[PDB]
Each structure stands twice: as C-alpha cells, then as structure tokens.
Amino acid sequence: RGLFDLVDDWLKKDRFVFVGWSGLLLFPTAYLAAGGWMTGTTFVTSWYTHGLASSYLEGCNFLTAAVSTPANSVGHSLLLLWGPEAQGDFTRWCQIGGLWTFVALHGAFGLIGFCLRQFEIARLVGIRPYNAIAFSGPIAVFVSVFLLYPLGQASWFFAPSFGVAAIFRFLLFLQGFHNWTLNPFHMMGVAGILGGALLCAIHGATVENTLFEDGDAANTFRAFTPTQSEETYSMVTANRFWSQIFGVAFSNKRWLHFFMLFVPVTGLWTSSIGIVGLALNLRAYDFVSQELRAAEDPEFETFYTKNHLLDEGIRAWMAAQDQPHENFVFPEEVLPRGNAL
Amino acid sequence: PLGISGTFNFMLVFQAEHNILMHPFHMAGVAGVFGGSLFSAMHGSLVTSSLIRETTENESTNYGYKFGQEEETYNIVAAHGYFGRLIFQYASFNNSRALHFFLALWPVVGIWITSMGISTMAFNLNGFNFNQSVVDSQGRVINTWADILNRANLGIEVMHERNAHNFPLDLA
Amino acid sequence: EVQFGAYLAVLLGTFLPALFLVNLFIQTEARKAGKAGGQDSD
Amino acid sequence: MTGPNPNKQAVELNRTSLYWGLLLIFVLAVLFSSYFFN
C-alpha cells in the first residue's frame, strides 16, 4: 500500500540471496572488510609502520602476509581517509596503516549486520532465535580482541594484524608479556573449544552408529527422506551404550542439542572476559607465594618458575624488533642467555 | 609433564625447537577444533531453534521430549529452510544422516592429522622456516612476520633447560 | 605467605552455592512426594 | 494483606541438574582457588 510496504515486500522477496533489511548493513560492510583484507595483504606494505614486509608484492606467501596495525605515533586515531592524518590522500593512508582500521571498523559493522540477519530470517521462518544468540559468542571475541584490547593498550599497534603469521606473533606476544595461558579465563575457554569439538565428534559418531535399517543398500546415506516423522536413530540404544561405557549419558534430545550450544559458546564468553582484563594489564602473572619462596630458597624449583624464565626470553629477545618505535637498543650482554646457547 | 603448568612448559619449548605453528598439521587441527566448535554450536542451535510445542511457558523446554518416544522432536524442514536462506540454498544438508556424519568427520580428521604433526616433529622434521626469505636487490634482509616470530622462538630456545646444555646446538 | 581471605573465598564459594543447589533438589522431591499421597505426604 | 497471588509457581530441579550444578561449583572452586590463595 504505502511506500514503506513496497520496500518491505521487496527486500523480503524469495530470491537467490536473502537481502532483507539487514542486508543493507551487512552486504556493504562485509564486502569492504573482505576486499580490504585481500587488497591489504596483496599490495599494501608494512614498511613504514612496523618495518616489515607483509604483502605479496614483497615476496610474502599466504602465511607471512598481513594487513598490519598502524604506528604507535598514530595512537588510537580512527585514521579516516579524510582525517587529519591521511588528509584525503589514498596512498599516504595505506602507508600509515589506514586499511587496518578500515578492515576492523567495516568488519565490526559486518558482525553487527550479520547477527541482525539471524534475527530477521528467524522471524520470517518463524523459529526461536538461538542462532543469533550463539553467534554472539564470536562477536565477543572480535570485539574484545580486535577492538577492546588495543583501546586499553597504548595504541592500535598492539592489536592483532589480519594475517596468518601476524596472529601467530600475537599468540607469542601474549605469553611473554602477559602470561595469558595462566589466566583462568583462557582455561575456561580451552575447555569450551576442546569441549565443543568433543561433543560434535561424539554426537556425530553416535547418531551415525545407531541408525535404523530403512533400506536394503549398504549405503545408509540414501535411506533418509527429509520430511519423515520417524526418528532416524535409536535413542534408547545410544543411551544404553554410553550408560555402560562412560557411566552417564543423555536421555533427552532437547537437552543434548542445547548442551551442544552452551559448551562452545560459553568458552568464547569466558575467554572474552579475560582479554578485557588484559587491556588493563590486570594479568595473572605470578603466584606470590611461589615467588617469595623461590627468592628466599635458591633450590626450590617448580614447572611454574620454569615458565617465567621462558618469558624473560620472550620479553627481551623479540622486544628489540617488536617495537621499533621505542628504539630498544639492547647490548649483547643484557640479553638473558642460558648456558652455551 | 602430567600437570597444568607442565603442559605450557611443554608447548612453549616445543615451539622454539620445532616451530609447530608454521607446521601445516597444527594448522589442520586448529581448523579441526575451531571448525568442530563451530559445527557443534551451529547444529545445536538449529535443533533448539526448531523445537515443536509440547510444553507450557511455565515448565522447562526440555520436558517436551519423553524418553524413548518415536515421534520426531523438531521440524527438520524448518531448520533446513532457515540455513537455506542464511547462506544460500545449496549449502544446506537436507539429509540428517549426512549432516550427523560431517560432525564426526571434521574434528576427527583434524586430530588424526594434528597428532601426526607431533609425530613427524618428534623426528625433527620441523614446520616451515621463512626466516631471511625476503631480500632487496642489494641483498639486505627485509623482515617479515616470520622474523618477528623467529625472535620469539630464539627467546625460548636460549632459555629452556638453562643449565642442561653444554654445547652450542640443542640436538635434543 | 598466602592471603587469609582466600580461605573464606573458597570455602564459602564452595559451600554456600552448593548448599543452595541441594535445597532446590530436596524441595523438588518433596513436591513429588507431596502430590503422590502415600506414606510421605503428611 | 490482600488476596492470594495467582502467579504462584513451583520450582523444580531434578537429580540430573543437581550433579551438573555441584560439579560446576567444585570445578570452579578447583580452578580459581590457586589464584585466590596467590
């Protein structure tokens, strides 16, 4: 009837890719985060920001290419193309590291626009919105690492660059400087990721091994029409199996599939709380009862004090080349070496 | 070491001496458990989304499943039409058997491949090494992200077992 | 030297929430024994 | 007073969800104790 109704009926039309209202936020912003990454890893260097090479023009393969974080002198500037740093020039915008905030900002509005996509399709199909709530897990890892972690730090420079090996140094930068593995929020996150991979490997292998005979063929994939009301696997058998192997087992398909939602997602929320606590440098660095004892008793050694000496090697050896803006000129005689290494 | 801090003594010393992160079999199992926790929470949401009304709003959602029943407890056509619009139509498994097989394939193949990464790195066939790989025409070494990753490996290598070594190369 | 307020953190972090979850189970079984009408309802 | 509330309901917790919630508290007590004692 009205003008709003014609636009509402056009976006929600059955077509190849469902656009909806949320596609106006997703499809422009996701196309430019992805294309900003493919351009930045192919053409744009890191020679002026980090003093590296992170492009395909500079000989890096898929692994050692990245869209890199800007300089520490930029601080937390948004680095707009028209801004006071770039001033409209495209070429000087790329050399400062403007594509990285271009990827991260238009990417953050892609994950907004993709989670709104999951509320919109669920309302048209008419189902409960648990996909949009389980996808809030990965939103809490993008925001609290690519956004909330460099905000608490000195600049955008201490953020993960969007490249394969550039994530890998961020894994190593976070052990030596922060002792991230000791943090109980990672420990509750590893329990959800390795726990979530566990549940789909079991529920994959128990459904597929309690199937009913619905055909004479040896292939069991053929014997399932999608609109049938009979269940395709014996729940009573699978309960009787695991009650004797493992001792305790699900007797509820509604509780089972909810539990496959809770376990992976909670590991992304609990691990997201800790990385917000490392923006503020509130790290779980030391057990002081272990540290006061190892200072007074020069014979008491645990595995825990062995990890601190591994972190002095990370804090001293890479920090010269890690942070060229700070100009660490270490002598050879201050770098902690071991015996004969 | 059978412990918790002993595990991270194991992982870091294994990084300096073998470069596991650049090895493509740790790469094929990070994809196994990130993918595994994806398809876990992606399958567990689409079943819980499309549950059929069998309870009231006062009692629990889970009590609409009586144990050992023969009726199907969720509209599988509904969750197929949702994911058939969330990405596109042809990327959706209408077959629930082939769906519940792909949940068992992806992690298990990802951990078979990974556990044969530790095995092939037990015999000192390490991961990739792109240190000093990018040079200018003059021949000076241009750093990459692998050179920054190398300086993190050199810090753990010169500090692990700080008294056990006597000779310049950690052969063990 | 350990913090002496951590004994109060842990042993009340165990007991107070765990004794809570016991109570929701005991009154659950009491309602089931309450409706059932035999030998235990009273 | 006034009349009885028609919004009185009952709370349930089966034997299954007891052992989840007990094990949830003890494992969080095992995990976070070492940091609290410092």
Binding site: - | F67, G68 | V10 | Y19, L22, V30, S33
Partner: peptide, 30 residues
C-alpha cells in the same frame, strides 16, 4: 595448611563423580 584445601577440593570433586555414575536417575520408557 594451604595444600589441605586443594586436596579437599580434589577428593570432593571425585565424590560427586561417584554419585553421578551409580546413583543416577535411571531413565525409563513409559
């Protein structure tokens, strides 16, 4: 004195594992 708490948390965790396996609410059809 400090390790006495850690031991009580560990064997206390193994108690509720014992009761969950053997005193489980046995599911029944009908």
């Amino acid at each position: 004195m400090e390790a006495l708490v850690y031991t009580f948390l560990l064997i206390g965790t193994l108690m509720v594992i014992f009761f969950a396996v053997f005193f489980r609410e046995t599911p029944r059809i009908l």
